[PDB]
Each structure stands twice: as structure tokens, then as C-alpha cells.
Structure 1
């Protein structure tokens, strides 16, 4: 196999036998074969749009297909086989439509040679063998490979955010069109300038999509607000919801109301505690456990059903006993785990089996006590603008350090905890995404009522951090956003974090420190241009980085 899309890739070069995340060869190869079929759909879909007869009937299929190949999202080979079969039928429908339109507009049959992604077909028995030759290493030129895979990696992060927006009824034609433009581009031989322009266009589409999901979440469930979140436990059985989907949360809360089953969040569902629509339920206890990578022991000790709305779902350890109470939904899949089917249009998912099972389980084991404060998304921070600006003017807040992003299991990530603990006491950390678990359970206190850690939400809520920076740029009359007293020390893990990075680069942010390692999908030549154009830097020592950031460098 060959996969290098996440920060934990083997030796920081690529996983070739079994992923470091646990992804076996057969699963990795099936994901490559699905991406190949998605490229075939994109070739014809792009041509139909160019002929003036666009077909958007595969929009949700493409977002879901891409999302299913994100790190820790779907482990069920049967799901990938079904998606590949369905994708082939969808592609052939587009091909037949294209051939007739082409003939009508040109007066002759289409006859130009097409990449194999547009024409290969087979039943499920042929998938495993075909998958071996259509993976990442099929691109021999290392720079072309780097730019194509960087585009697909950023694109799948954008696809995940666009899928959550779509779930809530929010869509923009430019996003779905770009999915096919970007996928089809990877079957073409393009210049370096054209390839880099597509990556920058993906960053601009990450801005669009992150703004759209921000709109969808806040319009539907209200603007996040300051909230104290309990991290201890109650005395009833509960259901633990993890991942990122807030519509699944809305439905789970409604269905569990009055049942005697409590609701707890986990991981990237922590921000559901900040939304006014969800704070109205007394049976919503709080947040359980820590980061996604600690879930084996934490899902075990939770004792009740666990619902994964999105990644990250980690394979069970041999000794784990919670498979019978593990539930997947949306694009998540796991062999042996019960899956909750998609809601009908205008309807709701059915979580009745989780509630019935939860009533038979003991209450969660208390693993810690106390609280976490958060809810500093853009509306909430802009409502406190006068207070924040006065604190900056007085010198009470010397600098903001953006430490948003996605966490992981490598030991080198203690760097983020150590940066948080050693930053001067007149600095404020801005966060979003599971990177927050490296420093959100400390006692950093506050500066005149403003907490030293301001959690805006999920990784997608890095959007709020950009909105805040743009507001401060205007307030302080600065010509360049980089001249604010703000440093960027971002942790990344999977493809949504890469989409956030591309959005920040499109927004003109320079000098970002990215860690704890730099992506394996950046070839030496591609890495050099990113350094040249954007001044992206690796992390250094805690002492060196703190000193440099405090000097604005």
C-alpha cells in the first residue's frame, strides 16, 4: 500500500505495509480505488459543465466518498466496495449523457483518448487487484505527485466541512463544481504554475466552505457563547457522541429527552456544549475524556453506547470490549459496529437502539472532575471587542498565540503543552480543533476576566479565529494582517487541518509554525516554494519558539 496523508505517516515518508493509524493494505487500496472512480466521475462532470449542461446529481456522493477516505473515518471494506460499485454506475450515467451532448454539439462521436479512471470497470471481484495500480505511486514525478496529493488532501478536508453544511441544508454550487475541477485536474498533465494555482484555489474554497459551515451551524443552533462545561459524570447511564456533526447531536438530544439516559460529548463534539440550542437540555451533562487518540480506554470506561458521527474512530485493541455498543453514522464505518442509516430528506436519524441499550448499561466511570470553559467563537469575541481591545492597549494582553489545529498521539506533541505552560502570563491562547486537548485542562487563569485559553470550537471554527483577526486588523488600522500582535503555532493531524492551513495561506497569513512535523506529501521543491512564498516554519525548541513568537517572528 501507499498512504502519506496524515501527520503520523510512517517515518514521515509514507505507510507502505499497514498504516500507523491501523489501516490495513486492503482498506488503503480500496480507498485509492474509490478516489480513482471519483476522478472518472469528475472527468465527465467537468465536461458536461463546459458543454453548458452541468449535472449536479452526484454532489453528495462525491463529498461523502472523499470524506470516507479521511484518516480514521471509515474502516469497513464492504462500505468502500459499495461506494466503488455505485460510483462506477454514477460515472457511466455521466459518460452516456456526455457522449450524446458531445455528438449533438460537434456533429461527430467523441473520440479523444481518456484517462483510465473514466473507462475502467469491473465487478467487486476485480477491485482488490485493480486497486494496487491506481494509487499514489502511479504518479512518477515527485513534484507532480506532491502537488496532486496536496490538492486532494486539502480537497477532502473541504469536502468534510461541505458535507456538514449540506446536512444542515447549506450548499454553494462553486464548492461542488470545484470538487470535480480539482479531481479531474489530477488526471491531466499541467504546468507547475497551474498545479499551484489549483492548490491556492482550494485554499479560497476552504475559506468559502468554512464560512458556509460557520453560517450553517450558527444559523441552526445559535452563536456559541461562554460556557462552563462539566468534565465529571452524572449518575445515569449515558450515550457518548463523538466526531463533529451537530445535526446528529440535535437529534440525539431530542430523542433522549425524558428517557433517563444522559448525553455526553467527546473529542470534537465538545463545542456542542457552547451552542444555545443544546444548552437547554438538563440531561446534557458535559464532556467526557480527552483527545481522540485516548479513546480506547475512555470509550471503555464510559460504559454506555458511543456514537461516532465522523472521524476520528480508532481501531479497537484486542482487549477492548465495547464493540457491541459502538455505533457509526454518516460516512463512518467499522466492521462489526452497528451503523445508523442516513436520515430521510426532512426527517431524522433513528437513535432508538442506542437509547434502549444505554438503559442496560452502568453509568460512566468518573475519570476526572472540574470544568472546561469555552464558546469564544466570532460573535462572542466580537461582543467583547471593547474589552479585548482595551486589554491590548493597556498591555494586559501583549500577544495572542493561535494554537488551533488537530492533535495526535506522538510524544513530540508535548511541545504544545510546554509552549502553553511557558508562555508569558500576559499572552492569550486562541484555539479550535482537538489540538486544544494539549492545554485546555491547565490552570492558566485569566487576564482581567478574559481567559488565557479562548476556545472557539471545532477545527472548522478556526474560521472564527480568522474573522477575529480580520476585525482586529480593521480596528487597529493595519495594512497587513500579519502586523497584529498574533503568532501562529498550529498543530496538524489529518486533512481538515490541511484545509484550514490552505485557508490561512489564502488569507495571507505568513510565518505560520506547523507541527509537530511537516507533511510527507510536500516534496523538496514544493516545500521550498511554500517557504519562499509563505514563510511556513517547522517547530523548534519550546524556549526558542516562545522567544521568537514574542518578538513577532
Structure 2
């Protein structure tokens, strides 16, 4: 039989599924606990949805449990079985209490009713509630496409909540959609509808996080970021959470410890509020997947605010700190997932005992082209399109990863004619943001809008251009979409773009294993989704 089944990321074995051990390092009992956690979270969603329909209140603490549970099961987020098992217990306790306040308990699912306190009972239940519990290929495909989209949505909703923003309609949708994925009566048409609705609420979640980030730290602006290093001890902050960075910068003031960013923390440099801390140094290294080498050479402690964390080498494991929903057995954790005060005193003391970073490279990279900054430049962008100086934009946003085939994205970028502009967001950027690609009329040929969530800015920019040019269809803009994906935040970004009517998206380096033949056919027929081949062939064909 199979010890596990997981197919949620781009690197899944054979582009079919991980059945023994995850390519990411996820062990079968860890995979089982995540399957059990998702199951009881869907049960909680049903109960909460029923309470809302009865006219009864559901406290925001329930919303936070749901988003934390989903985020903990994203690829490279949490490998800690003790933490995962305790989240299962907490969820069982919470949903039992909520169900007791229902007037009518009729029609509650097994997920709503089932509970366990012993890990052994959780592992046994997991075996019959995983991916392959749904027998029909199309229903399975759509249920898990939706679930993965909801994980990405929940991540963005959680970062907004950390910064003090939440919307009842967003949390209500997430919980109702989760419940619908266990309802056997829904047709394929119902589930295709729910997939597109999930994309729409993906836009809403990204809009909420955009407002939270910019409202707190200012609108991103054009910024030069040092990729070399200084000579003081440092802490390297990775992942996505800007509130964790704020607290870390405040606590390192006056200490002699510098702060550097990694991977998806690069865009923190673009926000005006963070420029006021003199000990906020550069961005160190590249995307998440190089971290076994780059965390080693950094020498100082590393703080993971979100995914992606890879199972650490023994050489630096003792200086890895996790926080929020991130976890790895044997790595120190700083508690907190709601933006509350976190005590970084131990990581700061640790940093003072470590060597300064070993430099990988020197120079700079430019970014900060989020929606406010690009709309301020809109007249000049529009003039350049009208004159033919800019012939095409290419959206190359998304996720990077390990696959050797991803040299495609570097070669594609290098081979583009010098009258094109790359638009990016997310760690996919690292395949081409240290090339020397130049500028068109002073506009850089790579425009970095920020984190994967700042794909929102790219959509806002596209819709603005549609308006100014007076076009009926967003697809009539001179934009090619060549997006790379790895984890579930890329899935919500994709669904968001589809909900906005974007066609002709080229997705790679492979297509998700969780798209069944019939579901893929709908995406091809209605949205013209395609894949990649060689960079030289696609540089001809895509244009």
C-alpha cells in the first residue's frame, strides 16, 4: 500500500504523488497529521457556517484557528508532529464547543463530529480521509484544487490579521468553501463554480493584505538594495511577515547586530518605514531552495516567519529559529501568530556569538514597482507603449524551486528582445533579477512589485492599462504570462487571475499533478492555459 499520499506542490514524485516520503522531506506520519488536521478544519468550517445561518455569532478566534491550521499544512511550513497533533486536539475541542451551541445538529458530517486526543487514533483516521478518499477523478481534482487555493488565501488573510485587518465576508467564505469540499451532493459544475469563486475571494484576500502592508509601512517605492554584506554579526529574516521584521528591527536598535533579508523578505526594503533603521542591511542570497548552502554561509542566526523552510543541516540547525505557524522538531520557536509582542532577546544574544556573514556576491538590485509607484509612472509607461519603445510586457511572477528545468526561466529572460519589460513578484524573480538586462527609456527591464501577494499590484496595473487604452478585454493588452509555480500561494494567485478573465497563461515548469484530464480540458478550452517547452521555441511561439 502507500504510507502517504501528497501531491500539492510542483516537485511531487513523478508529477503524480509522493507515496513513501515527500521530496520536501515530509515524513509519512507528518503527512498523516496534516491530512487529519485538514479534515477536522473542514468539519469546523461546516459547524461555523451552520451557526452563521442560525443567526449565531462565531468569534474571530475561530477564524484564526482555521487560517493557522491551513497555513501550517502549506509546503515547507511545519514538519513538527507534536505541534501538528496539538492543533488537531485544539480543533476538535473548538468544534465540539461550537456544535453544542447549534440548535439543530442534523446533517453534520463525520468531519464535524469525529474527535481524537491520542496521536495513534489521529494517524489511523488520517489513513481514510486523505486525497484518495474521493474516488471520482474530477471531484477529487476540484476538491483539492479548491483546498490548495484556500490554503494560499488563508496565508494572505493571516498576514492581514497580524496587522489588524480582517473581513467577516472573507473568513465566512473560507469556512463555507471548506465545508463544501466534504459535501458529496455537489456536482462537477458546482465545484467548477466554487473554483472560480475561490479565485474571486483570492483577489479579496490579496487586496486586504495590500491595504494592511501599505497602510502600516507605506507604499513601496523605487529602491536600490545592497546584496553584499557588512562586518557586524547579523540575523537573517526569511519568509513573508513584515510585522515580525518591524519588531526585530526595533529590538536590534543599539545592539550592534545587523538585520538582513532572505528570499520573500526582499520586498521589505521597498517600504519607506523600514528605511529609517540604519542597521537594516541588504538582501542575502537567492530563493528558498538554496538555503542549505546560503544559511550555512550567512554564519549568524536565521528566523523563518513563514514557509519555505527546508529540513536543516546539522551545521546550522542550532541557529534556526521558527515563529508563527512554522515548525521543525529540534529547532527553537518564538511563540506568536497574531502579531503580538515577540521577544527576540535570545536570537540577538546568539547573533553576537557568531561570525559576520560570508559574502556571496556584491552590487545591488532595484525594485519597489508596486501599484502606487507604477500608477505614478503610468503616463510615461503608456507613452512608451504608444511609441513602440515597449513592445510587450512579460509577467514572470510566481515561485522558484529546485528543478534543473527552471534554467528555462533564466534563459527565457536573457533571450527576450530588448524592447520587452519583465513584471515580477514572488521568489520566481531570483532566476533573472541578477542578470544585466538594462532599461527602456529609463524604465528598468525587470520591474519587481514585491512578494507573491504583490501579484495583486500586477493585476491592478493591468486593469489600469485596460482602462486608459479603452479596451473591452484585458487580454488585448500587450502582455504575455509565463508564470512559475511551486506551492499553494501560487495556486491562489492563478485562480485569482482566472477569476479576473486572464487567458493564455503559460504555467511551469510542469502542470500540477492535481489537475485531472477533464479539469485540465476545461482550463485549456475556456482559459487557454498551456505549459513550457524550450526557451528558444517559446521565445518564438509565445509572441
Which runs of no fewer than 5 residues in structure 2 stay unpaired?
none
**1:488 matched residue in structure 2:** 481
**1:147 matched residue in structure 2:** 142
1:541 positional shift: 2.0
1:535 aligns with 2:539: no
**2:90 matched residue in structure 1:** 86
1:49 aligned to which of 41, 47, 52: 52
1:65 aligns with 2:61: no
**2:395 matched residue in structure 1:** 402
1:230 positional shift: 0.5
1:76 aligned to which of 80, 84, 91: 80
Instruction: Judge conservation of contact 2:141–2:514 (CA < 8 Å) in 1.
Output: yes
**2:414 matched residue in structure 1:** 421
Instruction: Judge conservation of contact 1:226–1:375 (CA < 8 Å) in 2.
Output: yes
Instruction: Judge conservation of contact 2:303–2:322 (CA < 8 Å) in 1.
Output: yes
Instruction: Judge conservation of contact 1:150–1:521 (CA < 8 Å) in 2.
Output: yes
CA distance in 1, matches of 2:276, 2:321: 25
> SS at 1:454's partner residue?
strand
1:340 positional shift: 0.6
1:494 positional shift: 0.4
2:23 aligned to which of 17, 20, 25: 20
Instruction: Judge conservation of contact 1:45–1:180 (CA < 8 Å) in 2.
Output: yes
CA distance in 2, matches of 1:534, 1:219: 34
**1:358 matched residue in structure 2:** 351
**1:11 matched residue in structure 2:** 14
1:439 aligns with 2:435: no
Normalising by the residue count of structure 1, what TM-score does the alignment of the two structures yield? 0.96
**Structure 1 range deviating more: 400-409 or 53-62:** 53-62
CA distance in 1, matches of 2:199, 2:174: 13
2:509 aligned to which of 503, 516, 538: 516
CA distance in 2, matches of 1:281, 1:93: 46
**2:327 matched residue in structure 1:** 333
**2:243 matched residue in structure 1:** 247
Normalising by the residue count of structure 2, what TM-score does the alignment of the two structures yield? 0.97
CA distance in 1, matches of 2:527, 2:386: 29
CA distance in 2, matches of 1:134, 1:344: 30
CA distance in 2, matches of 1:532, 1:435: 27
1:174 positional shift: 1.2
CA distance in 2, matches of 1:34, 1:383: 45
CA distance in 2, matches of 1:27, 1:82: 13
1:201 aligns with 2:201: no
Per-residue displacement from partner, 1:112-147 (whole Å, max 9, x unpaired)?
454321222222241222222211111111111001
Instruction: Judge conservation of contact 1:262–1:283 (CA < 8 Å) in 2.
Output: yes
Instruction: Judge conservation of contact 1:224–1:274 (CA < 8 Å) in 2.
Output: yes
Alignment of 1:79-478 (within 5 A): 79-98=83-102, 101-102=103-104, 110=105, 112-124=106-118, 125-189=120-184, 190-317=186-313, 320-342=314-336, 347-478=340-471
CA-atom RMSD in angstroms: 1.1
Which runs of no fewer than 5 residues in structure 1 stay unpaired?
103-109
1:183 positional shift: 1.1
> SS at 2:18's partner residue?
coil
1:374 positional shift: 0.5
Instruction: Judge conservation of contact 1:343–1:349 (CA < 8 Å) in 2.
Output: no
Runs of 4+ in 1 over 2 A off after TM superposition: 112-115
1:344 positional shift: 7.5
**Structure 1 range deviating more: 405-414 or 124-133:** 124-133
CA distance in 1, matches of 2:77, 2:321: 13
Per-residue displacement from partner, 1:513-552 (whole Å, max 9, x unpaired)?
00000000000011101111111011122122222332xx
> SS at 1:58's partner residue?
helix
1:466 positional shift: 0.4
Q: How many residue pairs end up in the alignment?
A: 537
1:343 positional shift: 6.9
CA distance in 1, matches of 2:156, 2:540: 35
CA distance in 2, matches of 1:248, 1:546: 41
> SS at 2:282's partner residue?
strand
Instruction: Judge conservation of contact 2:162–2:338 (CA < 8 Å) in 1.
Output: no
CA distance in 1, matches of 2:189, 2:341: 46
1:31 aligns with 2:26: no
**Structure 1 range deviating more: 48-57 or 286-295:** 48-57
